Amino acid sequence: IAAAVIGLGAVGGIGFLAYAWYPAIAPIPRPAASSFSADAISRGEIVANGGYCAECHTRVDGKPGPELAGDFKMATPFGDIFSSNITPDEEWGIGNWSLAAFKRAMNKGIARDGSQLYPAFPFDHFTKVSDQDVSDLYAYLMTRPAVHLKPRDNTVPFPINIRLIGQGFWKLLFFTPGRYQNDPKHDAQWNRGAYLAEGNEHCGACHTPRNLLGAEKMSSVYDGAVIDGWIAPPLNDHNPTPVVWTEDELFQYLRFGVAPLHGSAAGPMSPVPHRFLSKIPEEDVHAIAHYYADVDKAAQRSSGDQAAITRAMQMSGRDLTGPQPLDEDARLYQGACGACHYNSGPNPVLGRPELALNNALWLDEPNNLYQVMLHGITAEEGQDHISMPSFYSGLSDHDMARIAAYLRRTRTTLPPWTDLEKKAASARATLEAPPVNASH
Amino acid sequence: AATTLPSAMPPEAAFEPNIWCAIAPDGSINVNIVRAEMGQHVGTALARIIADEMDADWDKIKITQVDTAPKWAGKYVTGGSWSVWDTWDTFRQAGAAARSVMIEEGAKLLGTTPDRCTAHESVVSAGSKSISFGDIVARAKPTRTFTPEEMAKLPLKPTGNRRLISKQVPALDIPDKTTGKAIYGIDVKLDGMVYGRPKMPPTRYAAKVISVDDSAAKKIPGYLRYVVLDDPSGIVPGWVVALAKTYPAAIRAADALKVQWNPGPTINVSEADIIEHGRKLAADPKNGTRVFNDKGVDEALTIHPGQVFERSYTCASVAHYQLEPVNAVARHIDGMWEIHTGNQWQSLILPQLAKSLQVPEEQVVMRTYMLGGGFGRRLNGDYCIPAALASKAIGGAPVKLILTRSDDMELDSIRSPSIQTIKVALDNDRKKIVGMDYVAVAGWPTQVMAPAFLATGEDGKKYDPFAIAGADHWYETGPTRVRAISNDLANATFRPGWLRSVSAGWTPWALECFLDELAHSTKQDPLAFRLSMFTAQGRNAGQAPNSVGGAKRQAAVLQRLADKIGYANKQLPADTGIGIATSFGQERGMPTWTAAAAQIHVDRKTGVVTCQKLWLVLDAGTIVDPGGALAQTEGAALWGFSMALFEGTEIVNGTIKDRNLNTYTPLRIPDVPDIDIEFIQNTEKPTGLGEPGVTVVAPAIGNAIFNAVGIRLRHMPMRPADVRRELQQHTS
Amino acid sequence: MTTKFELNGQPVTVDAPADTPLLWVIRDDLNLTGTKFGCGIGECGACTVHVGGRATRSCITPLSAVEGASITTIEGLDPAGNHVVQVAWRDQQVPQCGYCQSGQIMQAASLLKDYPNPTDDQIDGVMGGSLCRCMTYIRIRKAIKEAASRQQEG
Ligand code: PCD
Ligand code: HEC
Ligand code: HEC
Ligand code: HEC
């Protein structure tokens, strides 16, 4: 009371200010591109390709923006956050940044001027990137063409737009700076895979559920989350697909975008194996796959893979062979989807993904199935050279609900979904009619 | 002359003995085909007939699908399976005339009398000397022409064993259809073409446009304008066509148009309402026209009220769903209205097009293209008028009006739901039929589209031949009265249309199911019961040359079926049965005696009915094209199977309920049963084969169901839910 | 706007809205009327084309989805129209009206690429989507089996 409460509040305030406030490194003249060594440029190119630097630092909405120029819109639940320009621009960019300032931003999320960056920039994962990789990718960034584009202004409100207090509190509650620590309990390949997956590649950025404050639930790592309407399925034991995510399946999925059993990488995973993970050394992808196979615990769960595949083959051809005068939802599925989704042989045929094994039918919600039905899969989106028609206008919400209910009842052994029509409408409300086909 | 099928005709003139065939100086022989090529390969069969009669080389035969011209004078009708049957005599006479001219000219060139020279394989010879047809045309240059009455008295060849007829021959149109080179109505491209799409009114008839709001559609790139169709003929009332430079733009513009309508008086009419109106119409004995009314039917029926067996059978609506949606290109070029579309009956729609365009009939010409499946849908021709009106709205510039699947199904002239009541009076022994009373209420497509083609019954009143056909049975049922009643509610609500085997797909259903029910109720064998009434006495004695032998002929095929399937000693496992059903084909004037047997296993739990085997035996006289005949019979049998077990729709709020394949369920490849089709071999006059296969499939299956689980179904299609309901009721 | 892709082995650049279906781009913009328009909702197979050698429905495939891809139509199946599927179709006299037969032939070629020995179950599963209103399925199955046998001979 009085003196005591004032004193303790002042102590807490000065402590929070000392923690949150960071000095601003003096800006340096723009480094010449010739200074950096050629090999460092290639190593930084590999590092930045691994981190998907150009994915969410390029403007996609409206007109396409310049590479690495920022202005990418992120529809955060708290508001809209626009990625900063990381091209070596003198004023609106990192051109005046020094190596120390960029390293500080990578390890702590503090900009050159001392301001704190939002957790939309996943510094909690990039803080594990080693000094050598940081220097390499700084050298790579500083030699990219400069863009004089200014990112648009954020729409985040009070009291979250106040960078100092809000971001300092968020970092205090959840952020833990520090490079990845080598684990002696596992081999070099597993350590490299863990370093990449939890570091540069930040697989848990959208594969781990987040609480109300946007922080990843460390007690539910790789438990699957919801991003952009799609569902990122669990990357651990909790994956509901009947076939285990073996090392070979993981490597195929992460390198070529298609797996022999589970299927192809669509939606938000269209670019990850296609645009980024295919431009990094194959050893890195192999290490990531091995690490996640260890995390997935495939060595114990792989015993039942043959039985699961046989059961899926049995149920894949259900109602697709012989006369079908009884079930009308089965007729709709056969007419609309069964032509390219029927499998008979002991193993699936590449190019005909097995719905009885896919996560779209085994997940808790029909989000992935509805999103695939609506958007479709382009030629280079999932598996290479092959495409999938979009059923935005071919199927109404009722028809999509009928197909989803029939597939869940028949192609899986799980209990039926709930509110399928409302969920179908919600999924449809996130796009803008890919075809002008109509002609219902 | 639009498309010569095997190859283009040589450009060195030709000799035309008549209007049906021409002979080029190089030996090529062109045959003018006026029948629509909707998939039955009619041109190949007609060419076979004319080449066999002409005694010409088949390798020199080409067929031209000619456009509408005054020289053929309303011969462009293709329906009711009349093509081969009607063209038999005409093409035989034409070939005989051409062969006679060739024989005479070859004899003159070779210096011999015509009585000794003989022509074969497109060359006429007299002993050792010989000369081909092309050389004859090049040298003699014949100019003789034959009028139809001149050809009607020529010495035709004997109808026995022929050279080209009843021999396997590849179809002329198949090679083009395999490589995607066949041109349909939807493939037509004209200079300055503008695409168009309609906005369907809420009702088929009596719809009026109040206001149109095109502000939303003006933001669509490529959208030009909208036209509100004013129809002098009143065929497409209340239509609004949106025009664009590209078809997707037209689709989007039509979707974005805001049109206010007066719905009309039939906006809340359901299928049950139509069936109830049919029942009410059939209740009154004075309604309808008696197709034949023998004296004493009432006395026979009412003498013994306790010995009357009556049943009622209903058939639901069926949609064509022809694969190519109805479309047409229209333009006004060189002072003539050109319509490019696939049509089955050009001679019927030409006067309507002329009336709608307010031009003389000689100023309208319809180019002929391959049909993406007619099935009686293209007999309508109501889709050509909106394209012509839209073209007239912009001054005659080409307009390609294409209907989407939803619009095509809304405009579809569906098969009207029908209800038939059959009531017989038996003798004292309850074994023989003494009197018969047949009534059938349905929509009348001929009374709507072609009122001038209505037939006259024994009552002296006009009736639709394509709404009662198949009920004029050949059985010996004593005094028989057959009545056809026109459902005015069906005519007003929608446009009743001709389906494949029109009115012969549901009359045999009721008739054969009723006959089997009566046979089982009187403790009689259905086959023996049917054969005992095939006495072929009276009106069923048969005429010549079409129905030679009368009802006996039908009995023959039935007997053949009873020998093909082992009917006498057929032992089947539990819940398995065999059902038989016979019919005389399409019409009494041109009968195609057919019989069918179905082996059916009925699942007592789910009610699913599976056809293990389907036998068909047909007597269509001479089989001109064995492969074509087999293909047509297979298609017709599968159409009947689909209508009996799979296809079917409903009328909700005055319009068909299903709008695309998401709800409509036609037959697909996995559902095809095992079919065994046999043709009776004889030398009689050929009859139609495209339609008759549909006639007998539906009742037979139903009969088989009664032989499997003992439940009787009197509604088409027979869905598993109905079987489950019947089984649950029988359990009680 | 401008979408560039390889059609029938030739590079083409079509200037059309990215939401335009591949069917109407092929039929109208590229003047290849071999592909046909049926249901329009991807349930009849009349518009089947080959994207990357795999059968797909061009009626509900937007242009933006085939950027830089390889599209094969019925005109590009064989230079002389002597594909094994086409030869089997001609020998068995499968086409009645021929409207579906372009899509049917493309789907049969895709099936033969998938299953070199299509059993009855495989034929039902793969060709179930393709619909023929003329009901030429009896000849379709025989043609598929004959084409498979000829391919195995080869
Ligand atoms: N005898 C004899 C007969 C027949 N044939 C064969 O068969 C066919 C047929 O013929 P005819 O019967 O005559 O028929 P035509 O008339 O031509 O046609 C018509 C029909 O045809 C059918 N079929 C068919 N198919 C197909 N594919 N598609 C179609 O659409 C159709 N349609 C249907 C209908 S219908 Mo009514 O119009 O409805 O009223 S009539 C009808 C021919 O081609 C021939 O070849 C022979 O051989 N023989
Ligand atoms: C999407 C999830 C991102 C990925 C992958 C990477 N970055 Fe990022 N970055 C992102 C956002 C939304 C923001 C803005 C935060 C804010 O406070 O508004 C940033 C910011 C940066 C900065 C700061 C530059 C500035 O002028 O403040 C830098 C230097 C930066 N990001 C670098 C960077 C690198 C090197 C990445 C590859 C490892 C990378 N980012 C990935 C979003 C995302
Ligand atoms: C956000 C953009 C993501 C990042 C970064 C990573 N993943 Fe992901 N992943 C994401 C989505 C939205 C989906 C589902 C889409 C679908 O239709 O497949 C996935 C899917 C996977 C899978 C497939 C699992 C299954 O189908 O059962 C795997 C194995 C996977 N993701 C692994 C993975 C790894 C190893 C990542 C780091 C490199 C990674 N993902 C990043 C979203 C995102
Ligand atoms: C033939 C043209 C198809 C039809 C009709 C349908 N699908 Fe499909 N689907 C097809 C392919 C070739 C692919 C993979 C394409 C690639 O590039 O990734 C897919 C993909 C899916 C998926 C995702 C699985 C994965 O491998 O990513 C799902 C969930 C899916 N398809 C479901 C589905 C449904 C429900 C359909 C009926 C509406 C349907 N597909 C139609 C081929 C074809």
Ligand code: FES
């Ligand atoms: S039109 Fe594309 S499948 Fe029917």
Ligand code: FES
């Ligand atoms: S051939 Fe007429 S639709 Fe298949």
